[PDB]
Design a protein around this nucleic acid. Sequence first.
RNA 1: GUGAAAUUUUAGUACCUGUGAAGAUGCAGGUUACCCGCGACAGGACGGAAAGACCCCAUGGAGCUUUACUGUAGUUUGAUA
RNA 2: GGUGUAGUGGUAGGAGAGCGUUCUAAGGGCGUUGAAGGUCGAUCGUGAGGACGGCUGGAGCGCUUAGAAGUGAGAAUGCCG
RNA 3: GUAGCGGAGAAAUUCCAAACGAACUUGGAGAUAGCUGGUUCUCUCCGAAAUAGCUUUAGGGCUAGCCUCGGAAUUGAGAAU
RNA 4: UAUAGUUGAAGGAUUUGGAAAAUUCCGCUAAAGAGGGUGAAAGCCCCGUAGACGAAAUGCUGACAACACCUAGGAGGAUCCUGAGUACGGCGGAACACGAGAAAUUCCGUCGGAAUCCGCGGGGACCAUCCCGCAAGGCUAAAUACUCCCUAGUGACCGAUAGUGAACCAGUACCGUGAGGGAAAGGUGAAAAGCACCCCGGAAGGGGAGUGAAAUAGAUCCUGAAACCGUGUGCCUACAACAAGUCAAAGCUCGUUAAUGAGUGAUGGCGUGCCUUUUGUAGAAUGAACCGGCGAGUUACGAUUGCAUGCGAGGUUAAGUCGAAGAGACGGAGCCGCAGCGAAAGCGAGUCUGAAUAGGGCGAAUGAGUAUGUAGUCGUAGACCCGAAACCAUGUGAUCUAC
Lengths: 64, 51, 146
Amino acid sequence: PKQKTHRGLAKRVKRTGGGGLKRGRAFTSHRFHGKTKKQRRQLRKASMVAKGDYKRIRQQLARM
Amino acid sequence: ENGNDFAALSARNLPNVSVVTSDNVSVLDVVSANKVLATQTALTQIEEVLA
Amino acid sequence: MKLHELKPAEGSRQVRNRVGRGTSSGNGKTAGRGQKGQKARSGGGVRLGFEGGQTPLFRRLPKRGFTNINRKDYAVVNLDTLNRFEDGTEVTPVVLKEAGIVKNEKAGIKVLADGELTKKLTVKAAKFSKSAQEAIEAAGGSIEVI
RNA sequence: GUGAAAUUUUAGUACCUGUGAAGAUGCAGGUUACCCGCGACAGGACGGAAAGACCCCAUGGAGCUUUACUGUAGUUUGAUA
RNA sequence: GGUGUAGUGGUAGGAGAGCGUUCUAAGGGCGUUGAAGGUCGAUCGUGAGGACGGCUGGAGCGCUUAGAAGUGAGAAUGCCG
RNA sequence: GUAGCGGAGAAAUUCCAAACGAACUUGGAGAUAGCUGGUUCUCUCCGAAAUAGCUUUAGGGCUAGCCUCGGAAUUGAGAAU
RNA sequence: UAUAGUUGAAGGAUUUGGAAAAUUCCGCUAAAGAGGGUGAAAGCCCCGUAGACGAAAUGCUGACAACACCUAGGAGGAUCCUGAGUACGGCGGAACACGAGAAAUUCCGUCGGAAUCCGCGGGGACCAUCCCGCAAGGCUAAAUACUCCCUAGUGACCGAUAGUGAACCAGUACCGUGAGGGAAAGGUGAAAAGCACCCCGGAAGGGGAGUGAAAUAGAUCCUGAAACCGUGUGCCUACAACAAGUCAAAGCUCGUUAAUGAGUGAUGGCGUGCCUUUUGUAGAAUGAACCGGCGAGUUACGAUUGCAUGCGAGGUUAAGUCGAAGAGACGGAGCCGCAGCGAAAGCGAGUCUGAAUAGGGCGAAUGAGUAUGUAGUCGUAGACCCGAAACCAUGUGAUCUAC
């Protein structure tokens, strides 16, 4: 049959123009009294997926 | 060529001879034979479909 | 070519590897699998993306956004592609098709200015960026959203 | 006269003191010993028979208990036909 | 092709290149003046392996090039004899 | 006559066709087993690990570290004094 | 048209054999050189094949005839009709890819319960407006699924431990109260010509003589491997502690694919099997009595990388139609690539964040793809093979034992 994509990954990630994967950040929904303003200012910028994670993740997102 | 049926009948049964019409030549027919004996009419008809 | 002297092209066919056929081949006796463990069993292994029991990377990250149901995507053609027409032609979505430049015009054509035109076209399309229309009109033509 | 069995890597299959997966017929150094059998005894072959029943594990089972969780047959109480 | 210099222990495992079995196609062959199979020999190649000769045997079988695989056995307290 | 989510028990977890903490037969069924056993031809080149971190994790796994094959790249980035 | 049938071309000698279809000469035939048989391998010997011909009877399928049924316009808009315990709503369940969810639509149980063309339902809670339909009555060919069976065939499918469990009198013998479980076992020769007669012996069996190309092809019958059991001989062996060989070597006995020959060997040095699992094994850790046969990374569909070929800012068709189960043309729905950024509205070689033209993120700046073949890895499928204790759902047992 066909391969099924991981529907939980696809709701969380997107594919950039040179093949990468933009991602959101953690520690960004919850107790902000436990973290500094500089931390929460700098946890507002997106990032990318690392090479260890991508090697193990590649096949689940092949089609979207 | 075409409904040249007397010729195809006469050429059957000879153990060195194969008979094909000009709308039904394959790659495997031409490679296996040593020569091709084609009539003038059939030659133009092949030139019409290979274009 | 004769049917008793066939030869494929070099590098085009390779043979095959058969495991479990003696020691000297390199892959007898466990056939490349190492010693014991879950990965040495027939049908052994863990599912894709599994990580032991640590929280998997997809599950620490938050979800994001929504899909719009009236989304419009267009079928860009820039400015070099309008150089393969004669000086004065009235390029249009049916003359773009039937040259194969655009097949599958999603929600209509949109012209983009990247980067250089020298013709006398009169372009008919659904959308124009500010610089596409501009450079089209410098070279000396006209636009019409339609 | 008739006629099995469990067992079995191949065997021309000694003793002492050592060595060694730390208790050797088979390895070292010695000591003893012509070749082939019969009737008897059980010290060794970690002798045979039974992939330890003792102990721990498998995010194994199964039977049992209850003020462990989540359900339910049965019994009861109200509304409505 | 010559000549120099350097190298060539190996378990898990990666990479390369080959030997042999059965069947398909095309080509060129052998066979009751004896095919396959079996048995013996003091033969050849770096290895898997290849020939030639005797005896047995009685009807089928090699070689070249390409293709396809139920394609190689010493072990599972394996299964049948 | 009483039948397996069952029967029968002067009560022993006792009996229900030489086996009963839940009979026998067929099917789901090639149940599942992070465990144990086995896995069949040849030569040439290279050649590990037995560690860190996280883990209902500790004889399993994942990412890094350590092996092998193919490419790219400015160098004079590597090593030993 | 199905179910019996008819007719159907063309060869002799020679060599080797028991026997030719083989060999060598010289001929003929083909709308027939597909296949099977015959004392070995046949276009021309036999059965057939290509082509031509045929049905008393019964059954099927067409066509055209009869017979049976069914089917008309224009206008009006006074009034009447158009499927009721129904649509629908509350409560409880289920079906829709949709797990109560913001839950439209379709069903079942229970209770409540419309309107009538100035009407009624739907467009995914709900309302207004616009648009598309007219429930609560019935039937209907084809295009799609399957093969116990009959005819005609086909296979880079098996060839007697294979292929059906079963090539043979097989669901048999055998096992169980029963439901149920379930095998082993093919081959003389061209032709039985299958050994008349004699001799030893109760017979079995054997030796002659005969058959036959061959009997060491004699019915336990083609070939006839190994384990295992014997008989005969060249060389060694009764003072010797041996994982059984290997290297050195006198004597004796032979004489080969002819070369730095072959068998045996007193005596001397050295030397703790094979496999598995282990930090580590001769292991007193694990497996194997021996010999033979069988017995384990495969395929389908997807995803990715390397190699190879054709086209190249492009590449390529799917289902389907004609065609020999084929090649070999039609078919452009569709798929990938050619532009990105942003949650989105959107903007575009740029865009998002931001008051910012600042800075920063991701992109551009000549920067190659696509179809197919082949090999390496992965996913879904039993997915390299063998191995539980158990769980569930139909059925069969009180001829033993308990009451």
